[PDB]
Design an enzyme around this catalytic site. Sequence first.
Site, PDB file in Angstrom:
ATOM      1  N   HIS B  79       0.831  -1.197   0.000  1.00 20.11           N
ATOM      2  CA  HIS B  79       0.000   0.000   0.000  1.00 20.11           C
ATOM      3  C   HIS B  79       0.869   1.252   0.000  1.00 20.11           C
ATOM      4  O   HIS B  79       1.839   1.314   0.715  1.00 20.11           O
ATOM      5  CB  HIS B  79      -0.921  -0.002   1.229  1.00 20.11           C
ATOM      6  CG  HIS B  79      -1.906   1.134   1.248  1.00 20.11           C
ATOM      7  ND1 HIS B  79      -1.852   2.147   2.181  1.00 20.11           N
ATOM      8  CD2 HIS B  79      -2.944   1.433   0.426  1.00 20.11           C
ATOM      9  CE1 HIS B  79      -2.813   3.022   1.934  1.00 20.11           C
ATOM     10  NE2 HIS B  79      -3.488   2.611   0.874  1.00 20.11           N
ATOM     11  N   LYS B 378     -10.865  35.638  25.165  1.00 22.60           N
ATOM     12  CA  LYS B 378     -11.089  34.555  24.201  1.00 22.60           C
ATOM     13  C   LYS B 378     -11.113  35.087  22.761  1.00 22.60           C
ATOM     14  O   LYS B 378     -10.459  34.529  21.894  1.00 22.60           O
ATOM     15  CB  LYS B 378     -12.435  33.867  24.497  1.00 22.60           C
ATOM     16  CG  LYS B 378     -12.654  33.499  25.969  1.00 22.60           C
ATOM     17  CD  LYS B 378     -11.475  32.775  26.553  1.00 22.60           C
ATOM     18  CE  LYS B 378     -11.684  32.496  28.021  1.00 22.60           C
ATOM     19  NZ  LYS B 378     -12.829  31.572  28.323  1.00 22.60           N
TER      20      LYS B 378
END
Lengths: 428, 429
Positions: B79, B378
């Site tokens: 893979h 914030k």
Amino acid sequence: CFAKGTNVLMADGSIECIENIEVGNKVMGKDGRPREVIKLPRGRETMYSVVQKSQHRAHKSDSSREVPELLKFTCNATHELVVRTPRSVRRLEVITFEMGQKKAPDGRIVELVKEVSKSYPISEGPERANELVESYRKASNKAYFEWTIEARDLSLLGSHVRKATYQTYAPILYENDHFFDYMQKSKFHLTIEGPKVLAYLLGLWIGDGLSDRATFSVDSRDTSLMERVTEYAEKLNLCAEYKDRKEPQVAKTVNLYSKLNTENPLWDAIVGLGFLKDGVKNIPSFLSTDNIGTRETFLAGLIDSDGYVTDEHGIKATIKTIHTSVRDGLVSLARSLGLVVSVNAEPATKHKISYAIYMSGGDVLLNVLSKCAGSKKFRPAPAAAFARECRGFYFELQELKEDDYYGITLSDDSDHQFLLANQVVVHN
Amino acid sequence: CFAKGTNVLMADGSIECIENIEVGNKVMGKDGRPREVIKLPRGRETMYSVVQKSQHRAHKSDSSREVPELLKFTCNATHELVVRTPRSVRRLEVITFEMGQKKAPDGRIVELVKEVSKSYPISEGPERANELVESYRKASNKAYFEWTIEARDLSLLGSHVRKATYQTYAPILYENDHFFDYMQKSKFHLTIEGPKVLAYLLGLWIGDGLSDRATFSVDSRDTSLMERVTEYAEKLNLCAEYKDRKEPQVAKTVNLYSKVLNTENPLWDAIVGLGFLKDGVKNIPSFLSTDNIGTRETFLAGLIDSDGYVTDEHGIKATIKTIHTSVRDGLVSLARSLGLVVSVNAEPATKHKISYAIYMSGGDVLLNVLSKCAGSKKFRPAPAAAFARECRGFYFELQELKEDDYYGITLSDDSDHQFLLANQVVVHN
């Protein structure tokens, strides 16, 4: 425009109090080139102190161990702060940050960044909105506004704009060759070898070496380090003797004899150059204005013995130390390179306080880590060229009033800005 | 071509085990667009487990208290891993990372990234030296290489290159609108601002709300945040009652009563209805990760405004603390779905033996969340311009495993042959 005692950076790397500076003198410009002082304004005015905004703070007692975060100064009310504010636009009620003006209480009109909003009927279709944001986006080549605001006028800024506004400190681009010149002062120029190699080992010394002989720990941790200490010692014609450990199966002993440890070129350098102070380890001040590659190598060496490299939210290197001399010397050094630094007093044979020092800077830090030999410490050098830029710092202003101020005015031919001893970019 | 049970992200945001995918199904591409399955490769081969390098790992038929490492998958030996490596030139004897070639133990010649040195003559000047470098610097617009390498050929990589090489995960650009549809299909509420105010309110509740009614905490010292709560609870036709102390003097209790705390109110109904209170326990429902982006952002702003903190220190960053394992897992996925970089760290405290701190970063990606916050420390302004939500890298450990069956899928002839695993990791068919 500054309080008495304010330390400024002279065009030669020397520090000087604002009041002792004379006409003709040369201060340090943000580009590493001089700025000539032509006049010395003096007067009395309400003063304001500027202090970097922290998070973890307490310093204000000389009881020792209170981190002296260098970024602060006191200036008079009309002194102009060199500030930046990011450009911003929200939606498409499109809200933007724009240069505008406001009448101060005393009548004056001040130009300043302002939070602006424009709104029209949902009914009228988004046409006008998208022209607003696109227009805003075309309005500039930078993602921030660079401008000035006198100290007395900062209170006029609206909350959103005020909090987003920051000042900046500049890397020290000026370079001296003191490390080089000290090497010449002990037999010199004949055959390769230079200051980066010595600086690296001296870096190793501060990192985890003995304060009484040119000997430090190594063992493993990053293992690949050993081949480099021998190769570097070799470059300095010294000799690396490895012994039986020097830390619970994690560190070793490496004595760097003259091809000793006392009547030696390295410990001469150690206590000679200032790496060993009052029986304690310390990183010297000349370092901050020395050759840049030398500064990076000293740091690479220091990261190699007692540093912690992390990638999680961006590269970051962390050094812990108990000596305040090392702490203070490292913050200066890293900042001169243009790295971002913050210290942290935290818990810890047995001893009181320990200092955690984190540095960041992207490519600026990658330039340091690339010089490391330790397995978990080395990181590839940057992809492309890179500018050491000014870093911003949020601050708190405080009205004090009273006092005499001292200022220097540079030539009009110049960009009227210079560096305080703490690297903060200031105006006249 | 992976192990059984590997969850793939379907084109509609749903999730399915790789052995259950069928020809014609559409998986999720990294641009938020579908990728159709044209073939289904089965077989038996040596298997390789890929796991992100962290101090975590956690649950395998046991408890959820330990933080798990979610970025991972088991693929077969052949893979191809979708990886990235930064470009780099060192010194001005110059070392660079370059696309090169190497021969494997079998015959195979595989193109891979290699570290390369260039040095020679004295006195010639700043010609070749500062040349090799400047050249290297103009060589690309990109500061990294983008290539693939089979799991089995990974160990062919040099040490520097190997450690510098990483895989990637992509944000979820695809948007369902199950949130808006819940609202519209439900209770009593005209929108335009509706899903924004609701998501925000659900953020505050997840952050510090009572588990049996529409009540939560809000910093008392914060006027604009209190204003915000009033303004938004109002838009939802709710009435917000503040009470002195919802924490020993720091927060106020906020009760959200319907206008004229369980029955007949939009907030509690959505909490129960959308799955945020999953049978007595708080939860951040999965649909959220494939929902409207603005909504995912507002919800996060609410959480941050409630039990979070922002730092600018070494780059804008937000931290959200939760004592809830489910909120923790749903939060990690929600944040990544937006293209934020995320890390979880287990921490200390009758009392709670452990709490979880979840850190988020990502420049403009995060600023877009923060600009929707009302909390004084914030809030951060919205980005200066339009930004892209780019893939985020992660370093990984590969381990050769047992030979076992493998289940793969093949995408359209000529397409990028890449899709997203349910954990957002970018995979090649």
